Design a protein around this ligand. Structure first.
Ligand SMILES: [Zn+2]
Lengths: 82, 71, 206, 24, 132, 218, 129, 101
RNA sequence: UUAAAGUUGCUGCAGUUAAAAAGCUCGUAGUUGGAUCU
RNA sequence: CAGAUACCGUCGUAGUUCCGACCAUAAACGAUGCCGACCGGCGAUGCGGCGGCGUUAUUCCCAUGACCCGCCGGGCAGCUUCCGGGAAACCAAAGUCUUUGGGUUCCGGGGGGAGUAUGGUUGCAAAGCUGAAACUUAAAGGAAUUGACGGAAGGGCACCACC
């Protein structure tokens, strides 16, 4: 990924699953990257910003991508406590 | 599966000794019956005297007469 | 709702949920839908937690709002009970509707007639709309689904706990999503109630 | 059938018991 | 047997979906509107299209068909779809609620609802089908 | 004249997407060969590995049809393999080349010992599996070359690998499975997690989201 | 019966991380298990863990970070001299840039590089990468 | 190669099952392998009921039935068309035939 | 005769259908053996 | 029946039954050694225990039984799954195997000759156990796929088929 001279010698840096920390390969066509919008505290309209989550095909074949995204959104404050 | 202890060397070596005899190359080389049945007796060449000229007909699908000699 | 007091669910909405029978599920429970229910009542019917339903509906609305092109979102319903509510959801927000039979190869076959490349997919039933939802695993599609207590959650990324069987419940659930999408975009005021009533989304037996 | 050949090979042995003895 | 073919059926469906306004129930008029528009070879093929057109227009009066799409029919079905009663089906003076749902609403700080009415649940716990 | 039909082709043809690794980063399926011809092009070279006749028994005799295996590579970290069956050999080869282009994957290269210069070998020992055939790749010292059979050596040279030890188990006489097992092992180099790739990922906007306005008006 | 409890400890952790789980329970606990887990943790492979007391052989709850490819035991505990370590690490480790062999020496339970620094051999407990 | 997961039987968790005789051959068949049918028929057929009630001295007499349990070997159930052959997947359908309709 | 032979397999093979788990259980030698002490 | 030393039928000896000694073999099969850990769901069933509305032993006291709804442990199994494996058929074990080590017993090494000869041993016998070689051979074999055929089962058509 880098040599002794410090130069970066990697063709590209792949993505990693937000749930299982697995590398998302170039032929993983069942992986998703999802944006969830952010709102204003007062008026409650679309601020213009979003938060991004990447889920891998193995995790969303397993049936656990619904709970994974809910956990990740709870961690970021988007979803209320319980 | 196979035993994997630290005091298993005798078991492993004896089993290998016993099971090598089921290898037909090993048995043929190390048994001694294939050395007594070899007309050359372990030599690469041998000398002999011609008794008769013979003709051996080939195995199918080939049809010919291979020309041999009895020695 | 990020614990915000403007995004909390109100009594006029809980009364709509109760009248449509949204809180009422089936006799069976999927093991990955267990966290969304409150309790099982005698006569063996599971009760869905309306607080959880509201949170998941708002998350789905956020996911929809994040799509820049309104037409990139495709909404699909196979059963007739959802066919009037997906043609009406698509007429208010601009999404692309598919009501009826889904042709296999819509998302994967690149020379067909009705070939499309959505950025987001919303379906009415995971069990009934299974072909559009598995075909989305070939082309990197996120999926939002309306889920009952017996609904599998494969290839489902946002599952909304609701009664997806009753016509009133389906129409109400599609009408609430459009309402939240419009109120999050900022085309509808959040104080005045919507002048469109849920009845426009309902299914009528001829 | 191998059952019959097994039966055949046993009659041969039973007869060779008689025709090949220690007294021979 | 007297069964049409995909050529005549396709041509007739196209004619109906493109020229709904002029076509009607009469055969001898639809026979004359087809010759004016569609470049069709001889009378025998012209008539088998214009006969299935007349047959297929009667079905439209009974309601829509799964083979054609008229935008005027789209407008009519949209007028049918834009139907809402004055009093909705979801605004009720009294809503019947089970004792178990009432506790869920209590956890939802909705214990002040005044349209609710807790009912008596069924006692016999018999909700399964007999086996065999 | 490239008239693209997918929205990835309409962004490649309009200079918006300017790298193949930009498409690889988002795992988007590539359905048009002109996208590959656009970026790699003059770098690509192909090789016909075998021509397999296959037969289908019928009432009136056999029915013969020919199968072609084609490998493709730029010798600089990209490699693909495609197979096609058709009634005529020329058509089979022409159609297999397209598939080989559409299968092109990147290859990760690493260092055996000290890290001086460009990477020359596989980053770690990797195994590929295909229908009774197992192919193992082991990193090798610089300058050793590719110690392998003639069939996987072609694909290993196409991919830019310079040094590698190889091992093979199973029926390797079926080169259709022998070539698909080494191609599988090469694909895994960008799937193996190493302490190099332990950093948190930063998410960049996808091209579909970034060129929304361009795609709407085109 | 249960022999080599550390084998069961390491097989449970490997099997859970294949499933993408965030926590694993290990029973029974043992001090060899704890030292091996600490060696794995100081290299950034598992993360914080916790021991539950039972007035018996306790148990362990381990947090998993998705950074583990394999962790395995070697049975029996072969004796390793400092001149035979290179062959072992060639046979067991996936590369010369990452991976560790865990040994027990008279200076403690460590990995194959600390053993080289301290100039000592020992007995091989296992490996992880 | 193996055709059925249950070996064509119902034997599970036991060693030996007592045999029975086929009704048609008198062939020994294991009881869990035999094809069994319970037949409840009428003594008189519909071709004779009209001639039986007119001669009956009892008003509203109900004619008796006949109860027979029949056991078949695998060969007779096939020859007598009691059991047919069916496709590989259909073989896994073990619902009784829709006769009760 | 060595490699090829991971076709003698300690590293490192196989035993449902291709060669192959003893009819079953007991039992001595052999092999292996749970926490726990600065 | 061409022939029947068979299949079909009429008799019928040993045997089939019991008591007491031998014999130690089966497609003795789940064609799958035993002990231990981890890895997905769902509904049933047999036993033991624990809890809970309500029916019934006729109108009541409690236990006790028969139903009903669940939970726990040990069993015989079943359905489903992109858990993973496999040449595949298929298997929640036949999984956790080139990312190769939990413990241990037995056993295999291309096809024949051949489970034969010979020696030993057990048995009244029949036989059981142990068990070669000379020689011969380029394949034998396992799964799955298209056809062809079936004295295998279901449908359809024809006055060059019948009615
Ligand atoms: Zn019979």
């Amino acid at each position: 990924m880098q040599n002794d001279a410090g130069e970066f010698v990697d063709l590209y840096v792949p993505r990693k699953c937000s749930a299982s920390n697995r590398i998302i390969g170039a032929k993983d066509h069942a992986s998703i990257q999802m944006n969830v919008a952010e709102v204003d505290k007062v008026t409650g309209r679309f601020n213009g910003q979003f938060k991004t989550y990447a889920i891998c095909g193995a995790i969303r074949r397993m049936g656990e991508s619904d709970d994974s995204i809910l956990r990740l959104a709870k961690a970021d404050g988007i979803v209320s406590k319980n | 599966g196979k035993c994997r202890g630290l005091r298993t060397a005798r078991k492993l070596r004896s089993h290998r000794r016993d099971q090598k005899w089921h290898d037909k190359q090993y048995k043929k080389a190390h048994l001694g019956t294939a050395l007594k049945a070899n007309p050359f007796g372990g030599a690469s060449h041998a000398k002999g005297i011609v008794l008769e000229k013979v003709g051996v007909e080939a195995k199918q699908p080939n049809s010919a007469i291979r020309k041999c000699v009895r020695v | 709702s990020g614990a915000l007091d403007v995004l909390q669910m109100k009594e006029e909405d809980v009364l709509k949920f109760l009248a449509a029978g949204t809180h009422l599920g089936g006799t069976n429970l999927d093991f990955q839908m267990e966290q969304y229910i409150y309790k099982r009542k005698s006569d063996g019917i599971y009760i869905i937690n309306l607080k959880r339903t509201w949170e998941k509906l708002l998350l789905a609305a956020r996911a929809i709002v994040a799509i820049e092109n309104p037409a990139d979102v495709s909404v699909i319903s196979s059963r007739n009970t959802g066919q009037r509510a997906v043609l009406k959801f698509a007429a208010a927000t601009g999404a692309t509707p598919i009501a009826g039979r889904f042709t296999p190869g819509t998302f994967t076959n690149q020379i067909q007639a009705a070939f499309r490349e959505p950025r987001l997919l919303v379906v009415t039933d995971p069990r009934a709309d299974h072909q559009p939802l598995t075909e989305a695993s070939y082309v990197n599609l996120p999926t939002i689904a309306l889920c009952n207590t017996d609904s599998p959650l494969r290839y489902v990324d946002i599952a909304i706990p609701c009664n997806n069987k009753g016509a009133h419940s389906v129409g109400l659930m599609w009408w609430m999503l459009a309402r939240e999408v419009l109120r999050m975009r900022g085309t509808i005021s959040r104080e005045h109630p919507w002048e469109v009533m849920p009845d426009l989304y309902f299914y009528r037996d001829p | 059938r191998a059952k019959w050949r097994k039966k055949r090979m046993r009659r041969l042995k039973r007869k060779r018991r008689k025709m090949r003895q220690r007294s021979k | 047997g007297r069964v049409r073919t995909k050529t005549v059926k396709k041509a007739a469906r196209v004619i109906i979906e493109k020229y709904y306004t002029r076509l009607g129930n009469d055969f001898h008029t639809n026979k004359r509107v087809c010759e004016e528009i569609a470049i069709i070879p001889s009378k025998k093929l012209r008539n088998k299209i214009a006969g299935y057109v007349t047959h297929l227009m009667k079905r439209i009066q009974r309601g829509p068909v799964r083979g054609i799409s008229i935008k005027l029919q789209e407008e009519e079905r949209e007028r049918r779809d834009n139907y809402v009663p004055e009093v909705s089906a979801l605004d009720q003076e009294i809503i019947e609620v089970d004792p178990d749902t009432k506790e869920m609403l209590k956890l939802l700080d909705f214990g002040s609802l005044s349209n609710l009415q807790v009912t008596q649940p069924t006692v016999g716990m018999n909700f399964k089908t007999p086996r065999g | 004249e490239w008239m693209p039909v997918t929205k990835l082709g309409r962004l490649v043809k309009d200079m918006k997407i300017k790298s193949l690794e930009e498409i690889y980063l988002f795992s988007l399926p590539i359905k048009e060969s002109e996208i590959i011809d656009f970026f790699l092009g003059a770098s690509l070279k192909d090789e016909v590995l075998k021509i397999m006749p296959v037969q289908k028994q019928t009432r009136a005799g056999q029915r013969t049809r020919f199968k072609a295996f084609v490998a493709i590579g730029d010798y600089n970290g990209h490699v693909g393999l495609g197979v096609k069956c058709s009634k005529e050999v020329a058509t089979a080869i022409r159609g297999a080349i397209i598939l080989a282009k559409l299968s092109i994957v990147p290859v990760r290269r690493g260092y055996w010992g000290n890290k001086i210069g460009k990477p020359h070998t596989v980053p770690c020992k990797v195994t590929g599996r295909c229908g009774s055939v197992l192919v193992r790749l082991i990193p090798a010292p610089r300058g050793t070359g590719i110690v392998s059979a003639p069939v996987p050596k072609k694909l290993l040279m196409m991919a830019g690998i310079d040094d590698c030890y190889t091992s093979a188990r199973g029926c390797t006489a079926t080169l259709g499975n022998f070539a698909k097992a080494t191609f599988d092992a090469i694909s895994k180099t960008y799937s193996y997690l190493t302490p190099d790739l332990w950093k948190e990922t930063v998410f960049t906007k996808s091209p579909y989201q970034e060129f929304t306005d361009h795609l709407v008006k085109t | 019966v249960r022999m080599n409890v550390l084998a069961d400890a390491l097989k449970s952790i490997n099997n859970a991380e294949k499933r993408g789980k965030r926590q694993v329970l290990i029973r029974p606990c043992s001090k060899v298990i704890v030292r091996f887990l600490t060696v794995m943790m100081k290299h950034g492979y598992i993360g914080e863990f916790e021991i539950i007391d039972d007035h018996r052989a306790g148990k362990i709850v381990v947090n998993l970070t998705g950074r583990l490819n394999k962790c395995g035991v070697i049975s029996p505990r072969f004796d390793v001299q400092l001149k035979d370590l290179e062959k072992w690490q060639n046979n067991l480790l996936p590369s010369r840039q990452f991976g560790f062999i865990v040994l027990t020496t008279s200076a403690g339970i460590m990995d194959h590089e600390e053993a080289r620094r301290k100039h000592t051999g020992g007995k091989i407990l296992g490996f992880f990468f | 190669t193996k055709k059925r997961r249950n070996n064509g039987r119902a034997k599970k968790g036991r060693g030996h099952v007592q045999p029975i005789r086929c009704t048609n051959c008198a062939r020994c068949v294991p009881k869990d392998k035999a094809i069994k049918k319970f037949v409840i028929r009428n003594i008189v057929e519909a071709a004779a009921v009209r001639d039986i009630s007119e001669a009956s001295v009892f008003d509203a007499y109900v004619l008796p039935k006949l109860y027979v349990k029949l056991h078949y070997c695998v060969s007779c159930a096939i020859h007598s068309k009691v059991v047919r052959n069916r496709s590989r997947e259909a073989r896994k359908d073990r619902t009784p035939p829709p006769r009760f309709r």
